[PDB]
Amino acid sequence: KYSTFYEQRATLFEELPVTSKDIIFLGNSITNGCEWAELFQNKNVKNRGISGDICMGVYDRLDPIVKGKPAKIFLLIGINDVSRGTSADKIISEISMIVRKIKQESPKTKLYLQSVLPVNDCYGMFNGHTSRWQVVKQINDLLEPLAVKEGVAYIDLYSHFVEKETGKMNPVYTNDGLHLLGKGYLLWRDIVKPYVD
């Protein structure tokens, strides 16, 4: 069901042009689930999220995005690779490939690496994801130095969504332990709005 949905969205994305004014939100279902243009009241903000996507899935569909030379790319990816048992090291290594590809194909694009969001097992759903809540911090501990090493920005969403007493996502923003309710996207908007306009 992922590969067919991936192909549906990816072939649609190849028909929608990307211009140099565009602000791209790129990632998996946490990106897919939002109406980003409405959330920011900005016609230039475009959704390139695909539910279920992994790091190499994003890498393989970069061409219709970088060929447009967009203004900004906000990237949030990785949690689905955690659910497959992939280590934080390999995930960082695959995110590094995405960063280098973008920097070489579109050097004027501003790239923003967003921290992987925390998860919570309290609702008993997506146990492949939520049982590995400790890996989220392992990834972000490596993701921020990668951003500095490559000269791109790092956005700490994690600290605003997490409960410091548990290390898991605050249940007020989620109904399944992984995805966001409307209130979760409003918090996300408040954090990244300065980077958008």
What is the token pair recorded at 39?
């959330």
From a second copy, Na ion, none, interface partner of 191 (C-beta below 5 to 8 A by class) = none
Residue from the set 14, 60, 63, 89 that interacts with a second copy by CB under 8 A: 14
Rounded to the nearest whole angstrom, what is the least distance from the CB of residue 9 to Na ion in the complex?
15
Residues 69-128 interacting with a second copy (rule: CB under 8 A): 125
Q: Residue 171 annotated as binding?
A: yes
Polymer length in residues for the chain: 197
Residue from the set 171, 189, 192, 195 that interacts with Na ion by CB under 5 A: 171
From a second copy, Na ion, none, interface partner of 15 (C-beta below 5 to 8 A by class) = a second copy
Q: Is 134 exposed, middle or buried (0-12, 13-18, 19+ CB in 10 A)?
A: exposed
Q: Residue 154 annotated as binding?
A: no
Contacts of 10 (CB under 8 A, 6+ apart): 50, 61
Residue from the set 23, 28, 31, 47 that interacts with a second copy by CB under 8 A: 47
Residues 196 and 42 sit within 8 Å (Cβ to Cβ): yes
- Amino acid sitting at position 106: S
- Amino acid sitting at position 21: K
Q: How many residues bind Na ion (CB under 5 A)?
A: 2
Rounded to the nearest whole angstrom, what is the least distance from the CB of residue 174 to Na ion in the complex?
6
Residues 155-184 interacting with a second copy (rule: CB under 8 A): 175-176, 179-183
Using CB under 8 A as the criterion, which residues of the chain lie in contact with a second copy when the complex forms? 4-5, 7-9, 11-16, 33-35, 37-39, 43, 46-47, 125, 175-176, 179-183, 185-186
Using CB under 5 A as the criterion, which residues of the chain lie in contact with Na ion when the complex forms? 171, 175
